Amino acid sequence: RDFNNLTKGLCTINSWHIYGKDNAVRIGEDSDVLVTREPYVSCDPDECRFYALSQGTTIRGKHSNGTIHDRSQYRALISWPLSSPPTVYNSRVECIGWSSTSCHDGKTRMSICISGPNNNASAVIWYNRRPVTEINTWARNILRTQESECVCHNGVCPVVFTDGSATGPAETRIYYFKEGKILKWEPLAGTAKHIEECSCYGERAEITCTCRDNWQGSNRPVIRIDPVAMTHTSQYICSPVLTDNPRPNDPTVGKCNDPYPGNNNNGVKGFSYLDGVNTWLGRTISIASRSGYEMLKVPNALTDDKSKPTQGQTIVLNTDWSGYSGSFMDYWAEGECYRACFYVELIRGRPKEDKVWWTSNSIVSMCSSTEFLGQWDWPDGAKIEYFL
Amino acid sequence: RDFNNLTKGLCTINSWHIYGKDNAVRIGEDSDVLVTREPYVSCDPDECRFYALSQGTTIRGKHSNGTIHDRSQYRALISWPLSSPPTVYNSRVECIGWSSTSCHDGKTRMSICISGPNNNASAVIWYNRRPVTEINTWARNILRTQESECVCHNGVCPVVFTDGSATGPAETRIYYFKEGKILKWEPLAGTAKHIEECSCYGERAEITCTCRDNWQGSNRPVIRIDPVAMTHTSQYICSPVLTDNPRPNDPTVGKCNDPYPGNNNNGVKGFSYLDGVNTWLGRTISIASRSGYEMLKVPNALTDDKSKPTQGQTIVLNTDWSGYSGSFMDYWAEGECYRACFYVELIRGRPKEDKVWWTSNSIVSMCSSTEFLGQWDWPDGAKIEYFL
Amino acid sequence: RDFNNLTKGLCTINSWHIYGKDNAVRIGEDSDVLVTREPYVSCDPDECRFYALSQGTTIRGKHSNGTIHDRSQYRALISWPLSSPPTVYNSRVECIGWSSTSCHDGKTRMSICISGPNNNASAVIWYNRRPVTEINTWARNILRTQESECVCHNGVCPVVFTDGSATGPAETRIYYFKEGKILKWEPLAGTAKHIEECSCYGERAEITCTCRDNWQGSNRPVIRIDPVAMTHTSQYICSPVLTDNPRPNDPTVGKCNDPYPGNNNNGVKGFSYLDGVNTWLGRTISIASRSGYEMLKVPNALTDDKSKPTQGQTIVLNTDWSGYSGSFMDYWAEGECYRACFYVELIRGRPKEDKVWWTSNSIVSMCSSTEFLGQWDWPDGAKIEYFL
Amino acid sequence: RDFNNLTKGLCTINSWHIYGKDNAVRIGEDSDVLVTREPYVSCDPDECRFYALSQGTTIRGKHSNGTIHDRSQYRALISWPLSSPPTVYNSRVECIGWSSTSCHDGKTRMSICISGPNNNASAVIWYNRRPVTEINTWARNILRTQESECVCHNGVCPVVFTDGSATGPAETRIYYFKEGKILKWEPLAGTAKHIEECSCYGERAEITCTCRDNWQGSNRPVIRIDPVAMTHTSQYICSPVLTDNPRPNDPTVGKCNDPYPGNNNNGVKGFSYLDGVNTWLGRTISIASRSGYEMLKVPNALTDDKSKPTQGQTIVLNTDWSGYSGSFMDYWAEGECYRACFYVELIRGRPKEDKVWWTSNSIVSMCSSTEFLGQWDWPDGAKIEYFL
Ligand SMILES: *[C@@H]1O[C@H](CO)[C@@H](O[C@@H]2O[C@H](CO)[C@@H](O[C@@H]3O[C@H](CO[C@H]4O[C@H](CO[C@H]5O[C@H](CO)[C@@H](O)[C@H](O)[C@@H]5O)[C@@H](O)[C@H](O[C@H]5O[C@H](CO)[C@@H](O)[C@H](O)[C@@H]5O)[C@@H]4O)[C@@H](O)[C@H](O[C@H]4O[C@H](CO)[C@@H](O)[C@H](O)[C@@H]4O[C@H]4O[C@H](CO)[C@@H](O)[C@H](O)[C@@H]4O[C@H]4O[C@H](CO)[C@@H](O)[C@H](O)[C@@H]4O)[C@@H]3O)[C@H](O)[C@H]2NC(C)=O)[C@H](O)[C@H]1NC(C)=O
Ligand SMILES: *[C@@H]1O[C@H](CO)[C@@H](O[C@@H]2O[C@H](CO)[C@@H](O[C@@H]3O[C@H](CO[C@H]4O[C@H](CO[C@H]5O[C@H](CO)[C@@H](O)[C@H](O)[C@@H]5O)[C@@H](O)[C@H](O[C@H]5O[C@H](CO)[C@@H](O)[C@H](O)[C@@H]5O)[C@@H]4O)[C@@H](O)[C@H](O[C@H]4O[C@H](CO)[C@@H](O)[C@H](O)[C@@H]4O[C@H]4O[C@H](CO)[C@@H](O)[C@H](O)[C@@H]4O[C@H]4O[C@H](CO)[C@@H](O)[C@H](O)[C@@H]4O)[C@@H]3O)[C@H](O)[C@H]2NC(C)=O)[C@H](O)[C@H]1NC(C)=O
Ligand SMILES: *[C@@H]1O[C@H](CO)[C@@H](O[C@@H]2O[C@H](CO)[C@@H](O[C@@H]3O[C@H](CO[C@H]4O[C@H](CO[C@H]5O[C@H](CO)[C@@H](O)[C@H](O)[C@@H]5O)[C@@H](O)[C@H](O[C@H]5O[C@H](CO)[C@@H](O)[C@H](O)[C@@H]5O)[C@@H]4O)[C@@H](O)[C@H](O[C@H]4O[C@H](CO)[C@@H](O)[C@H](O)[C@@H]4O[C@H]4O[C@H](CO)[C@@H](O)[C@H](O)[C@@H]4O[C@H]4O[C@H](CO)[C@@H](O)[C@H](O)[C@@H]4O)[C@@H]3O)[C@H](O)[C@H]2NC(C)=O)[C@H](O)[C@H]1NC(C)=O
Ligand SMILES: *[C@@H]1O[C@H](CO)[C@@H](O[C@@H]2O[C@H](CO)[C@@H](O[C@@H]3O[C@H](CO[C@H]4O[C@H](CO[C@H]5O[C@H](CO)[C@@H](O)[C@H](O)[C@@H]5O)[C@@H](O)[C@H](O[C@H]5O[C@H](CO)[C@@H](O)[C@H](O)[C@@H]5O)[C@@H]4O)[C@@H](O)[C@H](O[C@H]4O[C@H](CO)[C@@H](O)[C@H](O)[C@@H]4O[C@H]4O[C@H](CO)[C@@H](O)[C@H](O)[C@@H]4O[C@H]4O[C@H](CO)[C@@H](O)[C@H](O)[C@@H]4O)[C@@H]3O)[C@H](O)[C@H]2NC(C)=O)[C@H](O)[C@H]1NC(C)=O
Ligand SMILES: CC(=O)N[C@@H]1[C@@H](O)[C@@H](F)[C@](F)(C(=O)O)O[C@H]1[C@H](O)CCO
Ligand SMILES: CC(=O)N[C@@H]1[C@@H](O)[C@@H](F)[C@](F)(C(=O)O)O[C@H]1[C@H](O)CCO
Ligand SMILES: CC(=O)N[C@@H]1[C@@H](O)[C@@H](F)[C@](F)(C(=O)O)O[C@H]1[C@H](O)CCO
Ligand SMILES: [Ca+2]
Ligand SMILES: [Ca+2]
Ligand SMILES: [Ca+2]
Ligand SMILES: [Ca+2]
């Protein structure tokens, strides 16, 4: 009916409670579950759904061979009911492509899928499930976007894209859409030196995105967007609690305005909630690989270059595989505050488990509680030996 | 539109007619049916559905091995259309966990799932399909709840939980929720010495729950809740017709205010309708194992310590497997009275049928008739040899 | 919104056009299609659906063995979208049992399922998808009903039941329901000597049912019901064009008020439209077995004991299997007249094709045209050898 | 609510962006995907869907053997959600037959299916999902229609049919339907000598159809219909850019009013958008077989017998299989102009890939952009060796 406005602050995060989990790889061992990766969660005013990029084959299907590859003509953004698995029969295709974002503005949903060969990709922006706008590649090198939900305020839904090198300077743009049309775009500004796969959330008329500096940084760049002024800033999380992967060991002092060095030309999509003392960071447990996942309460991580954890919660054990992670909230919930949520992609198969010829994932997702809840760990749960 | 009020009495129960049956194990021999256990039935104002705890794998799936276990990260409360089986493609996840309850208040549904390791479990209370409240374990020993529907009156939906030992005193609480928020909770009072898995129904502004004393009692404890005053009482069914399992042979006199002794540290979820002469008790036929199921009309069972059956109906033959059973009613039906209903869980596989490596169930459910109807028996119907 | 009234006459039937066909046995060779038999079609004001009695297993499932049997605890009335097959995932259970009828009254649907052992069966009458009324067996010998849709007028939906012998006099009753409640019932009157499986249609405030005299008659009994007066009459179709199966060869003169003799203790559900010159009869082509199906225009068949065909249409070749057939119309269509429709059940498997251990069917259905359309034949289409 | 009127012109076509793709053959290797051919796309005011003719078996099913044949009793027009595959469980049958068209008039949808033996076929015209009108064969030789969407204006939906020889003069008629009823029909007029499988679109109260002259022409006939006057004209595309298949090499001058000769008794359904300088033609890349697909901008193709391409876009590489192609638009989109769209059928299996015994297809579909977007190619993507 009316466009949603970001009028609330974050609820106090004292722990994380289980929100959804689809067990897709367990179930897909013997049912028609699509191979996916790059999953996320996003809410409409009346429903919240799981999203991901299909690979256009089931996991048991012979076409699952080769699905380690990120980009093909067979990928599409799909959505499906919360905590069900992405099956052939219940998955709704939002648009065709191999990089995506999607968000609801309070009236209807915008979905964006990018497709094409590496040197000639284009984004199509869908609004109310019809294509409205198209954007051609500007740097001819894998035009790509968030892989988790965008955020809207009064109809304005900013979206971060990158086109150019994954291993040196690239051309990142912030587009401000409304009803699927471009109001404005700007080149990246501020002190973030490289941006990929931004994870975003909105509170009190500001949108905060935690991104991946693939080039040099093991601290995460942060873009903050004013969706009214349609302007932004960028920096890094100051905290020495480093949250990319792979990454070096944690130091005692981080960097606010430069990449924290040690690891080049690699990373993983991740996220954080940056809200003064109410600040929580996600990271893999392993510094070397996408294994384990934990949440750490790091008061003032964004601005305090010596901030260390005051509390934490393990999400996935270090003996279990993790993957991309990202933020979403139910902007249409009851109550006085927005409840922070996140998902973690649990990647199975190649390259770490190469006795199968496929790569897929399942999803686990949590939201914050004002209680101090007991923790469990939440592995994918599938036995790779069953697929042999 | 408005909250439902328990304004009607029970219809006269003169027999039981078949209401629903999903044949899940028969069908799941060759289709994508999820492994479940702890099923139940619950109605919305416009639909009634089957509910259960998924095990996050199909029955033919290789992950069905090990599903005798009650608690894993792969379980969730699911619902699906009445008398269909719980399949991968038609099952709707209500929330994630390994103990649950759910009920509709006339406006929308509350669902509660508990998850966690044994010493650190938490309940999440969902209302209008969003998480609202969380409750951490208080005794650090398998926080657990009804495994069948709760009941609401004017928006107040009491729920019984237990945390603590299954084989000695435990800490049982009655929470009174409204819109997913805690109005009040109380510790168990009265003469029931141990409470698990309460089966509840509502009539004339009172809610009656028939529970399982796992510790000492082969008679069933009964909690009666006034959802206006938000107060309760507890006792046992007085009747010598004993209704837990396993249990000793029936005596001639029961116990009103103490466990009837003979069997320790075991039991099964069960139910009854306690309404003066219109009183019917469910039980397994076998005193030793979860086989068979019958309904017995035991006038004044609750209050008369010498009451014996005046009528009965066999539901499941003693040569067929039964399991948990519980009560629900369609509070939104037409007419002057609430029609008592129940389900029986028909457990197949381990431990009684150990040539398969799984444990699952199907559901049969009946409601009362004012006629004296002919009886059939209603087995699960699957042939275990087909799964070998 | 308002109850439907039978205010229109039949459209002129000049031929039959294809309406629906599900190819269930072809498709079910390699997908999760339920075994059924006793199918039919029925319309709501906004949709028309296929109906049948499930056998509670898929066709490829190992539980399909033994499905020649008519009555088990695993059967249910299911419905599913027009011309789709009855699958595990798209079939909606209306009620549990092994004999059924269903019709919409303009406001909501009534469905009736009978279940039980042979000597102790009961009907449950569901209205607005809730059980309302129950009827116990009166003759203790397979209480059974139409196996095709009932018809309503101003909320009154008459239903024909039989209880008693299939091979001698039985006790047939016409119940007049409204909102699932019994307004009245009457014992069969008139000159029909035995009634089973009535096929009904309504026009100009009268309901006509064409039934099966299993005992002695190879002509079909006809019940005509006034749903306002709640009274009926019965006789036989006068025509020498005999329409039961098996049956003797056609004579030159039929019988109006007695069974036409020659074949005892057998028959098949069938139907006709009896409307003066606009009269069409269905029958199997074979006099000996359920093979082939044809429509014959037999002016005044009901009343003229020498009436012979003036036109016809082959529906199923004599080299293809047929089965039960029955009538329905879309009472909520546009226009000035009700368009006659019918289905034919195409039975596959046992007893005629005994290299498989199952029995199932698919459905073909046609409606009348005022054109003189070209005919095709419409076989089930499945290859039994594929199932070996 | 009101009938749609064709009040807009075409948007400027500067390139084509990906719209939908179902990957049906890849997915159907290991899931219950129906065999189809003759697919298309059509929109309702609130949804756009894929359509095709089922063959009434899954691809892995043993009944897929023999599905090279165009006409059987097992075919039906089905629809399913955009970019999902046509599965047993999500496909909605529109009507039964082996040639079809369908379109929405702004109020509800008309669907037309033709069935029958070759010498005795009939069309049934469905409106608001009920049969309304029937049309018997007039030339007794495979009555057949568009195999892609029709177009409506103020309730009038013209439809082109052909009955008669595929290899000499035939009898083509334009029927003008409204609410499923025949307002008028006319025989083909103008200079087109043979018409099959018209692909249509509407703009500014005129409907343009690009058809297939199977008899003599390798240029495509064009019918232009005034749906207010209910009159039409026909000619050929003048352009030497020849767009049927198979076809001779392109000359320098085409023919406006006669078939361009070179290839007899063959062709493929195809389409074009004819709008002065904004004119784009589809064709296979190969002159000999249904391989590859490209779009060429050929200003004034309809009227200029020397027009050559000024721009183009490859859709499918010449090393990949193509098939039928056709036009549709979303008439209910926002904005000032109608966005041209098309699909291409990607045929797999027989006759070109005869190591499998089946023939099926997947779908790819694009719509126009006012940007000059980078191109990719969009193959079916399935590996035939996996099906062996
Ligand atoms: C039932 O469930 C409940 C609820 O979940 C469970 O309770 C939870 O238990 C977990 C596990 O213990 C806790 O998570 C950890 O939290 C600590 C932070 O809390 C500690 O420190 C606080 C701050 O201390 C500072 O200030 C205070 C005064 O302000 C001062 O006293 C102190 O000296 C210091 O200067 C303390 O306030 C806090 O105490 C409070 O809480 C206690 C309960 O935990 C209670 O006992 C106290 O009385 C008091 O109330 C407490 O001491 C996190 O630091 C920790 O995270 C580190 O460790 C894990 C490994 O366990 C690691 O994975 C993390 O990455 C992180 O450590 C790495 O990073 C650091 C920062 O750079 C670095 O310093 C470390 O060396 C280490 O780095 C290495 O590994 C990383 C990752 O691989 C790598 O990248 C690096 O390169 C390097 O190799 C955990 O998050 C929960 O907070 C707690 N929750 C609650 C509500 O209590 C309960 O256990 C369950 N019950 C059962 C029976 O199972
Ligand atoms: C078509 O369908 C219809 C409808 O379903 C079928 O009819 C049904 O038939 C069934 C099976 O017979 C009946 O169920 C049983 O009901 C009896 C209760 O009814 C009897 O007793 C009544 C009360 O008697 C007392 O009062 C009267 C006067 O008030 C006095 O005369 C009498 O002496 C006594 O003091 C009688 O009123 C009643 O008579 C009436 O109804 C008759 C019809 O049944 C009719 O003939 C009469 O004229 C009159 O109208 C009748 O006599 C239940 O007692 C019984 O349940 C016990 O038995 C089964 C085994 O069959 C068992 O599983 C139960 O658990 C239970 O027995 C155990 O528990 C007892 C209590 O503690 C204990 O005392 C027993 O020793 C036994 O305990 C052992 O086993 C248990 C369980 O394993 C274990 O835990 C213990 O430790 C121990 O080992 C049945 O429920 C239906 O009521 C009846 N329904 C109707 C409407 O009629 C019909 O059969 C079908 N037709 C066909 C052709 O198949
Ligand atoms: C394209 O499609 C079109 C449309 O579908 C196809 O045209 C259709 O063609 C079929 C097949 O031919 C026709 O079906 C048959 O219809 C006849 C009835 O029509 C005939 O008889 C009419 C009445 O005759 C009487 O009155 C007139 C004057 O009023 C008088 O002249 C006459 O002597 C007699 O006294 C005639 O009016 C009618 O003529 C009209 O139509 C003609 C077109 O057909 C046209 O040529 C004429 O000029 C004129 O306009 C015509 O002669 C049915 O009788 C017949 O059904 C019998 O036969 C089939 C076997 O074919 C059988 O299965 C049936 O059960 C039935 O025969 C059995 O039952 C009889 C009754 O008891 C019994 O008498 C028989 O001995 C036989 O009994 C045996 O078998 C049964 C069953 O196994 C068993 O139970 C018994 O015991 C015993 O063993 C067909 O239904 C369509 O009507 C026709 N439709 C149209 C609109 O034309 C066209 O063919 C297709 N084109 C192509 C190229 O394929
Ligand atoms: C990133 O993506 C972008 C966007 O997709 C990619 O850029 C696209 O690149 C493709 C491939 O190159 C282009 O498609 C072709 O377009 C040409 C038409 O454009 C050319 O000609 C125009 C008209 O020329 C005439 O007028 C001008 C002045 O008005 C005059 O100068 C000239 O001499 C002539 O008289 C030129 O205007 C145009 O130039 C413009 O654009 C250029 C970019 O392309 C730029 O460089 C220029 O500066 C200027 O701005 C350009 O020269 C089509 O002709 C062509 O289609 C033919 O060729 C393909 C094979 O490639 C074939 O399949 C087609 O069927 C067709 O050729 C057949 O048919 C002809 C007509 O009958 C016949 O003449 C031919 O002999 C041939 O016939 C044979 O094959 C067929 C089919 O098998 C058979 O039936 C016959 O019998 C016979 O055997 C392509 O469609 C895109 O237009 C271009 N898009 C854009 C926006 O730029 C970019 O490449 C990608 N980047 C990367 C890095 O990959
Ligand atoms: C899930 C898992 O086993 N993660 C381990 C993790 O438990 C650690 F032991 C680790 F050494 C690590 O990289 O931290 O290796 C991970 C993994 O073996 C990477 C190379 O294959
Ligand atoms: C479908 C079919 O083959 N029907 C034939 C039919 O074609 C006839 F040849 C028949 F002899 C018949 O009963 O009429 O036999 C039927 C069948 O063989 C019954 C005994 O098995
Ligand atoms: C898809 C494909 O391989 N198309 C080729 C295509 O690449 C060409 F090489 C062609 F020679 C052609 O017909 O143009 O043959 C097609 C095909 O082999 C037809 C006879 O089998
Ligand atoms: Ca990095
Ligand atoms: Ca006990
Ligand atoms: Ca008979
Ligand atoms: Ca041609």
Side-chain angles (χ1 to χ4, degrees), chain B residues 17 19 21 23 26 29-32 45 84 330 332 339 369 371 373-379 381-383 386, chain C residues 32 55-56 58 60-63 72-74 88-89 91 93 96 98 115-117 120 126 130-132 134 136:
Chain B
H17 72 254
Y19 178 68
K21 186 180 196 305
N23 299 296
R26 287 172 57 85
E29 191 276 324
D30 178 51
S31 64
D32 298 340
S84 278
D330 181 359
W332 296 272
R339 186 184 289 232
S369 178
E371 309 298 320
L373 301 183
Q375 60 179 1
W376 215 3
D377 61 290
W378 296 95
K383 286 190 34 26
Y386 291 158
Chain C
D32 298 340
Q55 290 276 17
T58 60
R60 286 291 199 181
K62 287 175 182 187
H63 309 270
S72 78
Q73 294 98 323
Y74 321 112
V88 178
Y89 317 121
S91 288
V93 174
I96 302 303
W98 42 245
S115 72
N120 233 350
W126 288 67
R130 298 178 169 97
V132 177
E134 310 74 48
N136 198 223

Side-chain angles (χ1 to χ4, degrees), chain B residues 14-86:
Chain B
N14 287 142
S15 54
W16 301 91
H17 72 254
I18 187 65
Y19 178 68
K21 186 180 196 305
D22 63 3
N23 299 296
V25 182
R26 287 172 57 85
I27 294 167
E29 191 276 324
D30 178 51
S31 64
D32 298 340
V33 168
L34 293 166
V35 175
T36 62
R37 258 209 67 211
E38 299 82 35
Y40 52 106
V41 192
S42 190
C43 298
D44 292 359
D46 56 346
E47 187 182 359
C48 297
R49 292 166 68 81
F50 282 180
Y51 285 71
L53 297 174
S54 185
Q55 290 276 17
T57 171
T58 60
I59 304 171
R60 286 291 199 181
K62 287 175 182 187
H63 309 270
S64 61
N65 188 354
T67 50
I68 197 182
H69 293 288
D70 299 329
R71 303 174 300 285
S72 78
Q73 294 98 323
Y74 321 112
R75 299 206 82 174
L77 173 61
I78 52 166
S79 76
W80 70 94
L82 197 81
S83 298
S84 278

Side-chain angles (χ1 to χ4, degrees), chain A residues 212-219 244-246 263 265-268:
Chain A
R212 162 190 178 168
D213 170 344
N214 200 64
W215 171 26
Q216 299 170 114
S218 289
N219 49 350
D244 209 347
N245 178 267
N263 272 274
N265 302 171
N266 210 343
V268 69

Side-chain angles (χ1 to χ4, degrees), chain B residues 217-271:
Chain B
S218 289
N219 49 350
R220 284 189 178 283
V222 173
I223 297 174
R224 288 211 138 151
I225 302 172
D226 180 337
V228 177
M230 304 192 291
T231 56
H232 72 283
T233 190
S234 75
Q235 73 165 87
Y236 287 85
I237 299 181
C238 291
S239 184
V241 184
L242 300 177
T243 66
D244 209 347
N245 178 267
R247 62 173 181 268
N249 288 294
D250 285 348
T252 297
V253 54
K255 289 193 153 313
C256 297
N257 292 118
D258 289 281
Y260 194 86
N263 272 274
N264 300 332
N265 302 171
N266 210 343
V268 69
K269 176 180 170 65
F271 74 95

Side-chain angles (χ1 to χ4, degrees), chain D residues 233-274:
Chain D
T233 190
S234 75
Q235 73 165 87
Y236 287 85
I237 299 181
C238 291
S239 184
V241 184
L242 300 177
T243 66
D244 209 347
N245 178 267
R247 62 173 181 268
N249 288 294
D250 285 348
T252 297
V253 54
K255 289 193 153 313
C256 297
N257 292 118
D258 289 281
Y260 194 86
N263 272 274
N264 300 332
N265 302 171
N266 210 343
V268 69
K269 176 180 170 65
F271 74 95
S272 68
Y273 280 91
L274 302 167

Side-chain angles (χ1 to χ4, degrees), chain D residues 4-45:
Chain D
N4 186 56
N5 302 313
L6 304 171
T7 60
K8 305 178 182 173
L10 300 190
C11 305
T12 300
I13 303 161
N14 287 142
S15 54
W16 301 91
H17 72 254
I18 187 65
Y19 178 68
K21 186 180 196 305
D22 63 3
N23 299 296
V25 182
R26 287 172 57 85
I27 294 167
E29 191 276 324
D30 178 51
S31 64
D32 298 340
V33 168
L34 293 166
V35 175
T36 62
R37 258 209 67 211
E38 299 82 35
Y40 52 106
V41 192
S42 190
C43 298
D44 292 359

Side-chain angles (χ1 to χ4, degrees), chain A residues 286 288-289 291 318-321 352:
Chain A
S286 170
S289 68
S291 57
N318 200 212
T319 46
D320 283 303
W321 301 114
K352 294 303 205 175

